[PDB]
Design a protein around this ligand. Structure first.
Ligand code: CZK
Ligand code: CZK
Ligand code: MG
Ligand code: MG
Ligand code: MG
Ligand code: MG
Ligand code: ZN
Ligand code: ZN
Lengths: 324, 322
């Protein structure tokens, strides 16, 4: 119906993912993954039974928390679809194998599963069972990976059942490498290396990037999924505003639990004292734009429109903050 | 009775740790930890109730598997006692705080807890729940930490209850840093960095090391406990021989599991095709001597005897190849 019409934009930056969420009965991750797997012919390439795929996807989506305002199945679907668009960037044409493509998309789908709506630092500071299990290191991201893989064991859920042993081992490694790179504490190191990769990048005559080993390849996929994870401010304003509403609700819910515990309230988590405009401008200035201008460098000029939107959105949000 | 005369060597390399296990009713970890904590006055410094210490130690010791030949409570006791000795080396006098000493000793005591007697690679290859939990990375070592800390939560087991919040945080970070560094897959990187530290080491007039910050201190502690973990071949030969017998028994049991599942048998785990003595010599040549020669460099000349014993023991296994 209308849904099929909205899913026509699946290859475009700015897909109305919230509409798809409404229209699909709160199943945007399932419907968007299915569409992209069909679009990329992934079922045939990897002999994935369509019943298996949908079963796994619905279980996966089920394990995103409905009551978590940002880190839910809509965010998962958004990162999946954004990664799907970045994979098709002309600078990367025929660079990645189907398995590498499958790894990047699967990693995006699972990358925040079972997210509790609080940060790693909160989990560490409250002596959580999760932090105890993971020794305070990439606590959430390790857990997302564990849950995402573990769900493959449920009945008729093994979508990788017809991969070779070699393929499965390789996919598992890449997926781990990619989701661990979504840990924000690794952002500055990822960025510093991505900048150096750009400085020395090699291209064919056709202008596609030359990535001739695993380290270079996985580094590009890591930063690709990281960009997609941090892509909200690069989206049309009507979408970006909705993401901003959700993250601040999630942050203030964490702030409320911190205040109740007599804890220092984390930056941007105090509903009484935070400023949304200032918060987003700082986010863009110190995190999102430095990352995206570096990606844009890597794939120039593929991402110029994305970078333009980001810069317009930054200009917009700063316009109501009084300045000298 | 006789346990007390053996415990007099708790300050010595080559403590009769197997004797201690027998004489203590297979409580070598509890006995040795209690002795060290009393010796270093750690109960008073950190206000650790003695019953709480003993209760935690007994529970920790119970979570080392009695049916695992090498990675059991005797190995934990050995690495604890060996770290205790390394910490007292003259070149390290007054270098570490009591909290750093506590962290090294606690890390040593928990560093292989709940070890199942199979390798990280075996756990990964067999798609174990543990490898699934830890995404194939430092699977055992992450697990040893989780268990060692979790046991603090059992009744009357929180030996850190009277540390400040900041002290707990700092100790927790150090213990994690140390135990994750015992993952053998990190040996080459750890050693490479230890060589770098030796090349640029700063000592006072009396040859005491001058560490400048957390990075320096934690690096020395990481390598110290790694040395203690890999100290078997530097011990008096009779100790070394028993340790070799035990690790081969545990390796062989893993190979039996691999063979039974139709897997490639891991290096040195095939009881039908082993060269125990040749393998100990290769172990020393490629892993243990390069590490201990580098440690000996750092604390020169404190570890000269240890190095000499290593080289003697190398010749024992060499002259013992059929
Ligand atoms: C739609 O907007 C967002 C979507 C995803 C996130 C997000 C993921 C992880 N973080 C948290 C910090 O690790 C990074 N911070 C950020 C701002 O200052 C610098 C260091 N944030 C944030 C968004 O913005 C928040 C608005 C209040 C602050 C950020
Ligand atoms: C007394 O000698 C040893 C004392 C301790 C170790 C030791 C402790 C932990 N490890 C790591 C393994 O648990 C993991 N390995 C990975 C590859 O092979 C299978 C299992 N090894 C080894 C010793 O020697 C081995 C026998 C021949 C040389 C090596
Ligand atoms: Mg995340
Ligand atoms: Mg170990
Ligand atoms: Mg008290
Ligand atoms: Mg220094
Ligand atoms: Zn995310
Ligand atoms: Zn050990």
């Amino acid at each position: 119906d209308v849904l099929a019409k909205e899913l026509e934009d699946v290859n475009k930056w700015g897909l109305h993912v919230f509409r798809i969420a409404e229209l699909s009965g709160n199943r945007p991750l399932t419907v968007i993954m299915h569409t992209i797997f069909q679009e990329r012919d992934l079922l045939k390439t990897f002999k994935i039974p369509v019943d298996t795929l949908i079963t796994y996807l619905m279980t996966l989506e089920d394990h995103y928390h409905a009551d978590v305002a940002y880190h839910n199945n809509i965010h998962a679907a958004d990162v999946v679809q954004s990664t799907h668009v970045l994979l098709s960037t002309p600078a990367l044409e025929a660079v990645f194998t189907d398995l590498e493509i499958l790894a990047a998309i699967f990693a995006s789908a699972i990358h925040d599963v079972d997210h509790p709506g609080v940060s790693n630092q909160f989990l560490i500071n409250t002596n959580s069972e999760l932090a105890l299990m993971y020794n305070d290191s990439s606590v959430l991201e390790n857990h997302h990976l564990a849950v995402g893989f573990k769900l493959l064991q449920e009945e008729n859920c093994d979508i990788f059942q017809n991969l070779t042993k070699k393929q499965r081992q390789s996919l598992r490694k890449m997926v781990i490498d990619i989701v661990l790179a979504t840990d924000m504490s690794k952002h500055m190191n990822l960025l510093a290396d991505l900048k150096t990769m750009v400085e020395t990048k090699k291209v064919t005559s056709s202008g596609v990037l030359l990535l001739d080993n695993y380290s270079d390849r996985i580094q590009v996929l890591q930063n690709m999924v990281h960009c997609a994870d941090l892509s909200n401010p690069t989206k049309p304003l009507q979408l970006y505003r909705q993401w901003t509403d959700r993250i601040m609700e999630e942050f203030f819910r964490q702030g409320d639990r911190e205040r109740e515990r007599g804890m220092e309230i984390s930056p941007m988590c105090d509903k009484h004292n935070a400023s949304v405009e200032k918060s987003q401008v700082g986010f863009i200035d110190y995190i999102v734009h430095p990352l995206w201008e570096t990606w844009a460098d890597l794939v120039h000029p593929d991402a110029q429109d994305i970078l333009d939107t980001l810069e317009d959105n930054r200009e917009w949000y700063q316009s109501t903050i009084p300045q000298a």
